[PDB]
């Protein structure tokens, strides 16, 4: 019926003065734009059809054409920034926001979806959607006593669009908009659907990826315990955004990091630091590095949770990017730690893997490692055991690597290596 139409036939039908013919042509366009292979978005735009679809969004008397035009415009807005821009330039934002209040759940859902695509384009279209007043009706759609009464796909689409409204930076979302959205986000973060949980966690991760004031807006809502619980989840689509959010939070003040620790997060890191997925291990080690950059009692919590052996393990064997995060964690630990804590670090076996990593072709990791060795040597001086550490670094082949670094292209690399050999 409306399958495999030409763009010219669609234009002929939409340009007719017959609402039923216009509806059939719009459905044909929807089916064309839903094609898995090279949907003809640019041809549809060139034909000048976007303004007609936008006008159809306002046909309250013909709900089917509202839905078909909404779907077609959704699939145009799902493409390039230029195609999304073509949708926005047609005046689609206010029309979709008006449709958010439709009595038909599938039309309201389609409007939510379209606004999600538009906002997902970037910060400018996100903020423009916000300025047109989308947040109030979107959140009103979720103002129910129990989210479980809503259709699964409906709730998932609402959660995803809300996450896009929290997404992107340069600039970050308006502070008032974040404050308006956060309570509903917390509620969704306590829902029991894995996709809703994943997207709510990703939204929180976006909101925490910024200055300490943003992190504080999030942490003040009391979501950190729920984030740690989700960090313990079995589904990777949930653990990944939870771990990203926790890492973001520990990039903030030591008190925010202490909220993460107080919620029991460290107890999950034995698994995370051995997780079979490379990215989980990497982000867990990065979180650890930002925790070891904190106070000495926080480093002591890391020690008490038995996590130093796991850092030694990552340093000994892991993807190189995870190993670099581990070197950073070791250098932060040695920078802020007590003498006893650095001694513990050595007793756990950090010297050999660090020395083995000195053979890397990444300047930054070599600087990190040499700085860590310098810190460890300072502690040794405080204990008068620099000779023990020198012997230990020699037996594992470390002195050879540092002597090679004495002749390195980077200035600070050779400076630090020369200083280490000269002074030790």
């Amino acid at each position: 019926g409306t399958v495999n139409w030409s763009v010219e036939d669609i234009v002929k039908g939409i340009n007719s003065n017959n609402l039923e013919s216009q509806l059939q042509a719009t459905q044909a366009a929807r089916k064309l734009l839903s094609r898995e292979k090279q949907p003809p978005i640019d041809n549809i735009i060139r034909a000048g059809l976007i303004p007609k679809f936008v006008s159809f969004l306002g046909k309250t008397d013909c709900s089917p054409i509202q839905f078909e035009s909404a779907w077609a415009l959704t699939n145009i807005a799902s493409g390039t920034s230029e195609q999304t821009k073509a949708v926005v330039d047609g005046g689609a934002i206010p029309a979709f926001i008006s449709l958010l209040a439709s009595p038909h759940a599938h039309i309201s859902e389609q409007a939510v979806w379209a606004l999600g695509n538009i906002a997902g384009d970037g910060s400018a279209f996100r903020d423009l959607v916000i300025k047109h007043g989308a947040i109030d009706p979107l959140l009103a759609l979720l103002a129910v006593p129990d989210l479980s009464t809503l259709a699964c796909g409906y709730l998932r689409n609402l959660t995803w669009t809300l996450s896009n409204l929290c997404r992107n930076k340069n600039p970050a979302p308006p502070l008032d908009a974040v404050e308006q959205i956060l309570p509903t986000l917390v509620r969704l973060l306590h829902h029991n659907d894995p996709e809703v949980l994943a997207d709510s966690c990703w939204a929180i991760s976006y909101l925490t990826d910024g200055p300490n004031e943003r992190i504080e807006m999030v942490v003040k809502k009391g979501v950190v315990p729920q984030l740690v619980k989700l960090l313990g989840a079995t589904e990777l689509p949930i653990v990944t955004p939870a771990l990203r959010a926790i890492g973001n939070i520990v990039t903030g003040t030591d008190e925010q990091t202490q909220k993460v620790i107080d919620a029991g997060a460290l107890a999950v890191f034995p698994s995370l630091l051995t997780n079979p997925k490379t990215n989980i291990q990497k982000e867990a080690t990065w979180t650890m590095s930002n925790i070891t950059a904190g106070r000495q009692d926080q480093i002591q919590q890391v020690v008490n949770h038995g996590l130093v052996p796991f850092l030694v393990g990552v340093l000994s064997k892991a993807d190189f990017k995870t190993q670099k995060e581990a070197a950073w964690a070791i250098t932060n630990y040695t920078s802020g730690g007590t003498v006893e804590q650095i001694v513990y670090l050595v007793h756990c076996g950090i010297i050999e893997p660090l020395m083995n990593l000195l053979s890397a072709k990444d300047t930054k990791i070599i600087q990190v490692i040499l700085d860590a060795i310098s810190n460890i040597f300072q502690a040794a001086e405080k204990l008068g055991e620099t000779e023990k550490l020198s012997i230990m670094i020699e037996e594992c082949g470390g002195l050879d690597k540092i002597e090679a670094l004495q002749r390195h292209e980077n200035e600070s690399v050779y400076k630090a290596s020369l200083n280490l050999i000269e002074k030790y």
């Binding site: 839903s34 799902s78 493409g79 979806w113 384009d121």
Partner: peptide, 9 residues
């Protein structure tokens, strides 16, 4: 990361 945009099929 979730998709920035989604096509309805």
């Amino acid at each position: 990361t979730p998709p920035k945009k989604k096509k309805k099929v």
